[PDB]
Design a protein around this ligand. Structure first.
Ligand SMILES: COc1ccc(Nc2ncnc(Nc3cc(OC)c(OC)c(OC)c3)n2)cc1Cl
Length: 255
């Protein structure tokens, strides 16, 4: 691989989570020459090995401030590891639940613009994410949000992606809408109290999630635009970013 790193340059500290393929740790990465940095470390059939590491191969393609950075991989020895830049505030949904009502509308829009820029980048690189959700976005101490996570998540998924089991950047726009709703509701679960079948039923009857408490109308309307049934009518991510940039420069619109 590239970003291949010798395991001797890796200091594992606290276990912080439980992964599909094993433990996730906080630690430090000291490559000689380079400054020591802080990393999250995922540790691991050959099938499962190849799979585990595929996210490093995919993540290795990207460089953008709102896309999680691959700092390194260990594939020459055991355990196999994936090292990413450490994000101190964890997953966006739980971070917002912890801070319910405590960030301004401007701050929240900045988080959403960050995510939309990350997505604009992915779409530009013809990469379709398929599981864009607040739980798959990470947050650092400066509140910078980064897309992560490189069997259908029903409530985040566009109707046509559910119907055809095929995904596009326009289906990612739908998911982005759900993510806006999650942010402005401070990490409430989409369709709070509904089962998956209830949600699909609702969406087919043209039900849409309402404005979250205290949510400016301009933001909720952009959600509804991302949730247009015709996927061609949905804004592309350059347009999502432009629309958020307008609100930011005219922030009486965020009253
Ligand atoms: C499955 O648990 C899991 C998966 C992936 C990560 N990756 C990662 N990469 C960079 N930074 C972080 N920081 C985190 C992530 C957290 O949960 C998602 C988290 O709360 C446990 C946290 O707290 C300090 C930091 N994570 C991490 C994890 Cl746990």
């Amino acid at each position: 691989f590239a970003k291949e790193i010798d395991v001797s340059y890796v200091k594992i500290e606290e276990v912080i989570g439980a992964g599909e393929f094993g433990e996730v740790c906080r630690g430090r990465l000291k490559a000689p020459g380079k400054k020591e940095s802080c990393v999250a470390i995922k540790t691991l059939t050959e099938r499962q090995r190849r799979e585990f590491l595929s996210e490093a191969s995919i993540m290795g393609q990207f460089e953008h401030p709102n896309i999680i950075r691959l700092e390194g991989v260990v594939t020459n020895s055991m355990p196999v590891m994936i090292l990413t830049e450490f994000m101190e505030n964890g997953a966006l949904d739980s971070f917002l639940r912890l801070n319910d009502g405590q960030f301004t509308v401007i701050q929240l829009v900045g988080m959403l613009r960050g995510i939309a820029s990350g997505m604009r980048y992915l779409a530009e690189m013809s990469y379709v994410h398929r599981d864009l959700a607040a739980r798959n976005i990470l947050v650092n101490s400066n509140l910078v949000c980064k897309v992560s996570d490189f069997k259908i998540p029903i409530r985040w998924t566009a109707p046509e992606a559910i119907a055809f089991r095929k995904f596009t950047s326009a289906s990612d726009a739908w998911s982005y809408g759900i993510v806006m709703w999650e942010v402005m509701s401070f990490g409430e679960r989409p369709y709070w109290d509904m089962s998956n079948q209830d949600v699909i039923n609702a969406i087919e009857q043209d039900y849409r999630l309402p404005p979250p408490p205290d949510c400016p109308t301009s933001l909720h309307q952009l959600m509804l635009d991302c949730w247009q049934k015709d996927r061609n009518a949905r804004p592309r991510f350059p347009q999502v970013v432009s629309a958020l940039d307008k609100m930011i420069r005219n922030p009486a619109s965020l009253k």
